[PDB]
Each structure stands twice: as structure tokens, then as C-alpha cells.
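Suppose you are handed only these lines of text.
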Amino acid sequence: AESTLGAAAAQSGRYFGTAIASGKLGDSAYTTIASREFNMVTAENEMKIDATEPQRGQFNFSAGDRVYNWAVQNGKQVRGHTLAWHSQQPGWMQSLSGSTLRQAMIDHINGVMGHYKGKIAQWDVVNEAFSDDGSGGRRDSNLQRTGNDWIEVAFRTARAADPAAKLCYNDYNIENWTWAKTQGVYNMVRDFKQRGVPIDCVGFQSHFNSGSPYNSNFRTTLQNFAALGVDVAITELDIQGASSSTYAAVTNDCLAVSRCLGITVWGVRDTDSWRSGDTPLLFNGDGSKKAAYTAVLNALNGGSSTPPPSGGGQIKGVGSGRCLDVPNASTTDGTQVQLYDCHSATNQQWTYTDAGELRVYGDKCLDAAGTGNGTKVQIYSCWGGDNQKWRLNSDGSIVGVQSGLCLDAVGGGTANGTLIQLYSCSNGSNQRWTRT
Amino acid sequence: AESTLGAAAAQSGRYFGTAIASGKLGDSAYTTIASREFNMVTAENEMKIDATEPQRGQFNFSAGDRVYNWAVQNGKQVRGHTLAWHSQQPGWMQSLSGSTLRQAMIDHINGVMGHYKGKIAQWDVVNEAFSDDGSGGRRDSNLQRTGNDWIEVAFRTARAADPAAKLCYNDYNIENWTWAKTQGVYNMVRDFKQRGVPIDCVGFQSHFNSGSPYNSNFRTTLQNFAALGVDVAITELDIQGASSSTYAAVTNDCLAVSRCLGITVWGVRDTDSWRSGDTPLLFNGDGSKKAAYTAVLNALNGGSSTPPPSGGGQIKGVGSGRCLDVPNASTTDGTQVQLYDCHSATNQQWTYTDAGELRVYGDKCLDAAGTGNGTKVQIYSCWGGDNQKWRLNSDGSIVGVQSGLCLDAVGGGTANGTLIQLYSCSNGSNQRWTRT
Ligand SMILES: O[C@@H]1[C@@H](O)[C@H](O)OC[C@H]1O
Ligand SMILES: O[C@@H]1[C@@H](O)[C@H](O)OC[C@H]1O
Ligand SMILES: O[C@@H]1[C@@H](O)[C@H](O)OC[C@H]1O
Ligand SMILES: O[C@@H]1[C@@H](O)[C@H](O)OC[C@H]1O
Ligand SMILES: O[C@@H]1[C@@H](O)[C@H](O)OC[C@H]1O
Ligand SMILES: O[C@@H]1[C@@H](O)[C@H](O)OC[C@H]1O
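From them, the structure of the protein bound to beta-D-xylopyranose can be written out as follows.
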């Protein structure tokens, strides 16, 4: 299909998944969205070391299976996460070092993979093994201290435990090619392939923020790794601010690399995010689609053959030919917008921001004074409210994030002065627009 | 004094207050801000009818006195809120009608005012007695059904009860001079003054949002009421989104009217707000000052000497004489800003938005990648994080809302290429800027 992320991704032979939290499965709003939009599931925490082996030699899959069972019942494949990692290790493992730890690591891999044998698409065998100090070397952890060959051992162990699973090395801050960490991981994967160490994929967490911003060279990074003869996957995608452009850019990078298996965003709603403060996901707390959601979907569907305007630009309604206009170039908050003959003027220059706003005059925002039909569409000081965020559908309609309603020309009017309101989307020509 | 809102307001014989919730007086973070910034207090709930007369004839002033005492002890006057109101009436009063209710209203007024006789600066004697249907008439309530003269009776009773208190009529949606409701209240007060009804002030709640946006004619409203021979007061100010320009506009509206006694914002921090989702106050939940705070303080202190930049402008470092410049006009997220000979170029044109952002290229924001000294100041997609919010202090320093740190030209460098970082504010020339 082309209406849901999963189905859209499938159109390029890829999947689109999310991270599922078992404690949220009782939330109808949560499951409704999760089941509908994704065809791949990763347990956010239920398959980690502490959750699967709370005591040494004592495995527990109750939490993991709650996620797993839900995924299969809803037709989703599953990414196992994660088998060997310095973080979230149960206390009994944090106390280990040397050979004792090495064998515990091997035992854990066997126990967890054995339970899920033949049921997992991808396994993040080893997670975050490289340093984040900026050097490019191995992270100093109890695991790394058992010997530099611990990662290799983890992978060989995993291959034997379940030959049907794709074995991935997963890490963050390895998306920017210029970063030393990225290159350190490349060198390790290269070495592995050259010596025959079992490894089928590299997972790029993709936790983008102003500290580790997404960069266009992410595509070369993916290509570079793909060339090593391994698949690549965006595993824990979230973008601080959820820029619609960045989300589409990341999506297109993956679609540009044939080895990119798919994209998993780390969570369903911003409120479910481990970093909700950065509102980095595709759905907001209300369960409504954010501006970025539409951008990702449109990208998955191939995008549009109409390059979106770069800075400023009028918004012409197909049904009237006239442009979205602010009555007499007013700058008064609460001024309802109207349809007026297009012409070079600031009160007709609208900039669609990455946050989903339709700005005018530079700091005034298309604002909805309500969520129901007939709601007055006006201009108001930009503050980021969902009643100020809009989704630009490929069918030309402009939907309000908070209301889920379309920009509608009152009474279908097409003459100058016709006011703009919100109203259930109808596909009508008085609700379709074009950028110029 | 001029480093706190209260002190800055006192310079013109005015006050800057807030609404105090007695339960929060036990929280240090709350009281630290409240006791420091305001010189006027309104009990958010402690002095309402239900809270003061749970049962007819049985008055309970415990909660009210606790707020009152805290106020006076910390150098703040008090606004009594509120004596006659259709809403939030005790269960017993709600069931009353006709003359029985009329007597109840009168008795309540005498009881509460008698208790606080001579200690209340202003009393919201009657509250929200007008309708929002557009008729400009009285809202139909049990109080109004007692007789249209109930408001007048309320005020006459109040005057006799305590001659030292200024008697105000308080309401919302009476800020926009063109609204029917506003005219309704205007005519009533005009009639009252002409007939000698004892009323000394009109309180404008000033709850501004998309539904009831702030309009510059608010000053006209205040002036008009002022011309009636009554004082005016902004009693419950909060602005959806806390627009800096709107907060500054309301402030200047009061400063422009000699009869405007002062401004009270409805809450301390956004998390204390009855409308927290609209983050409509001057302080963030973590207690940090928002861009709007600095806008209000600068306005109260008499503003700058030269009219502030009307969007789009250079930011020049005092010590260097050079401008904030994005290297090579790059638009790549993560690019660190620098100092450079000032010239006409978009990569040197910054726009300070109402949200407190410093935008460039229209949709890129001055961004801090961290909160500690040495943090890199760069450009990043605009999304609204506090790490993208800035306060333009009167001394020329620019402080990050999240970090509390100042924009700093690294090492006090003055040459082209000098990088910009965050650093503890020092009043150094490499931390002072002018927008011209
Ligand atoms: O919930 C968090 C999870 O999302 C993150 O991946 O790892 C740490 C957990 O606390
Ligand atoms: O905003 C409109 C303006 O653009 C047009 O030129 O004249 C009519 C106004 O309402
Ligand atoms: O313009 C609106 C039209 O698009 C809708 O179909 O019916 C209501 C009208 O006001
Ligand atoms: O009278 C008011 C009207 O002027 C305004 O436009 O909408 C609200 C009404 O109450
Ligand atoms: O950004 C700078 C640009 O404004 C100047 O013109 O040339 C040098 C660049 O670094
Ligand atoms: O720029 C900084 C300067 O302002 C401070 O005084 O010393 C450290 C420098 O990095």
C-alpha cells in the first residue's frame, strides 16, 4: 500500500518498524497506531541482557515474549535487541570480568538465541562496542577488557546458536563518515569479512540531534558499509525536533542503498520516547500524525515530481486559482486568512518549516482556533502549537496536525475574500493547493 | 531597582504580580521565584466563595490567610479574588435563587471583606458577569436572575464593608475594544460612574490565546475605561506560547496608561499554570527565565534607547566590531557560527522570534549543542528546544534559556573566523552584542 509506513516501505522491498514497550501494549491508542503503521518490531528493553537473564544461568523470557507474541499476531517480523552490551547489564554481570565474563557473555547469547531460534529476522548481537570519546577506538568496558576479540567471539557464538538470523553489529554516532567512530566500526566489519567472522549487517542507531546532527554523507557511510558485503539498517531512528526534511533525507538515504533493509524509529509517540523532550518521533502524544510522518510517507512512496519551494512561496488553491492571502497584509493576530488573486506580496509568501508550520512575515503562523468543522483559520504568533502544525499531503490537501482537518475554502467559495476554515477532508478542489 | 519584575514595575509606581497556590508555597523552587520577582499576590483559589464559605455562615479563612500572610511577609500587596461569581459556588449557594440567593451573596461579601478589612489593595468584587454569546449582555446565572441590579448591590455592599479597598469588576474577553462583551462592561461601568455606584477599577483577566488573541486595541480599551474615572489592572495575564512581543506589548499598554496599577501573570512557572499545555508564563518548569521574561523586564525598565530591530538584522560583537556570521553561508546543520566583518549577506541576518529564537535563512536556528562552558554555538533545524531559545539582556549579553550561559567569542578573539561558544556570563566585551 501507500497509506501506512510499513506498506509504503514494502513498496521498495523494505520494512518500517518501531520499538515496542510491553508496558504500553494495554494502551489501545498505542497498539492501534503501532499495529497499523509498522511491519517490524524491536523490543525496546524486553530482550536486553538484564531482562532475559536476571540472575546468572536463570533465563526469563516473559517480557520478551509479550512483545514477540504481539508482533507476530499482528504480522510483524522481529529484530532481537540485544545480546552483548556494556549497558543495562544485570548486576551479576556488572560484577564480572576476564574469562568469567567472557563465558557468561557466550552463555547469555546461547540461552537467548536458543529460546528465539528461527523466530528472529535480525539480532543486534553486539551493541555500542566503540568509544564515544571521539577517538575511534573500542569503548572501555568490562567486555572489552576480557580481550579485544570479544566481539568476534560473540558473533561466532551467535551464528552457531541460530544460523537463520541475520547478525548485526549495532551502534550510534557512526552515521557521519567523518567521525572517527564510524571509521573504527568500518575497519572492524571489514576485518571480520576478510577473516570469515560471521556478520551479516550493521545497524545504524541514527539518534540524530544538534550534538550529533544528521549529515548528507550518511549515504556514503551506508554505501561504504554495504560494499563490505553486509546489509545495513537504520535501527533506532529519532530526530531531535523531528525535522520533516531530515526525516525525509534519512528515508531517502536508505532507499538509495539497495542493501538498506529498512528503517525502525525508536518509538511510536513522542510521549513514548526515551527522549520525549526532543519530540523526535512521527506521532505526537495525541496519536496524531506529525509533519514528519507525512514527509517520511511521501519519501517512501517515491516523493513528488514537483520540487518543493525553497524559502517563501505562494499557496494557490486549485479550485479558485487564487492564493492564500492575509487580508490587507495585516499582522494582527486573529486575522482569518482568505483567497485572493496571487501577486508579489509578503501577505502571500508562506514558508513551510521543517517543524510543520506555515509562516508568513517571518514570525506569524497559520493558526487554527479550534479543532472542529468551521474552525477559523487565522494568523497567530508562532509558538509551535499543534494547531499551528500542518501536513502537506501528496494529493494537494493541507491537514492540521491537531485537528486532522483540511484547509477549506468557506462554502467552496473561489472569489477574492473567501475565508479559509478547517473541515473534514473531502478531496474537493477547495481543499487542494499547490506551491509556487 | 530593575533586575526583577516587581522592582522594575515599582520604578513607575506599578506592581508586577502573580497567582499563588498555597500548596506550592512549600516548594523552594517555587517560592524562590515567587518571592523574588513579584510584589503583588492573588490567591489562585484560597479566597474564592467555595473556599471561604464551605457552608453558609461558616467561614474558613485558613488557606486564604496563609497566602495573605506569605504575601505581606515577603513584601507583596494582595488582590482579593473573588467575592461574587456564578462559577465555582459552594454546593449550597448553587441551589439558591431569588432573594434568598441575593442575601447569601451580600452576606458572603460582608463576611470575607470584614475578615480582610483594610488589608486588601484590590478586590475582584464581581467576576465574569457577562456572556460570551456576542449579545454583550449578562450571562444567565442564578445571581443574574436575582435581579439585574445584583452587580450594583455587590459593589455598594463591598464599599460599606471595606472603604479602603479598591473595588474592581473582573472579567475575561473584555480586552478587545471591538468585542460586544467589552462594550457591555464598558457601558455598565460608565453607567455606574455616572450614577455614583462605588466601583474603582476594572480587572482585565487578559487570558490571551488563539481563541481570544491579544489585539493592540487593548490599550484603547484601558484608556477608555481609564477615562471613565476608574483604575485598570491586568489581573490574570498569560499568553498562549508566551510570545515575547505580545508579553512586551501588554506591558507597554499598561505603562502607557497612568491609571494602570500593574500587571499580574496567572502563575509562576508554566507547570504551575492552569493552562500549562500552552506554556503561557514567564518561567519554565525548571525555573529558568524564558525569552518573554527578559522582554517584560526590558519593557518595564523603559526599553532601549533606539527602536528594536523589526526582524532580520545583524548582531555585532562590541569587543570585535564584527558580526555573527554562519561560515560560507552554509545551511548544514552543525555548522559553528563565527565572527566576521559585517556586510550585507543572509548568513549575517538574524531574526529574533517571539519564541526567543535567533533564526537565519528563515528556518535555521542559533543552537547550543550542550549546556556547559565551551559548548559550540551552531545552526540547527528550528524546532523550539530551549537550547535554541535566547534572552537579549539590556546589557548586550545574549543568554541561552536552557544553559543560562552567554554567547561568547572564543578567547575574546576579534578577528574573522573567531568561533562562538557558550560560556559563563562575564560582562566581557566578547560577550556583548548590539543589533544594528
Ligand atoms: O527505555 C530506554 C531505551 O529506549 C533505550 O534504548 O535504552 C535505555 C532505556 O532506558
Ligand atoms: O490582502 C489583500 C491584498 O493582498 C490585496 O492586494 O488587496 C486586498 C487585500 O485584502
Ligand atoms: O467549504 C466547505 C465545503 O468544502 C464542505 O464540503 O462543506 C462545508 C463548506 O463550508
Ligand atoms: O462580539 C464578539 C465579536 O466582535 C468577535 O468578533 O467575536 C466574538 C464576539 O463575542
Ligand atoms: O561566512 C563568511 C562570509 O560571510 C564572508 O563573505 O567570507 C568569509 C566567510 O567565512
Ligand atoms: O572566550 C572565553 C573568555 O570569555 C573567558 O574569559 O575565558 C575563556 C574563553 O574561552
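What can we learn from it? Residues 98-116 of chain A form the longest helix (19 residues). The longest strand of chain A covers residues 77-85.
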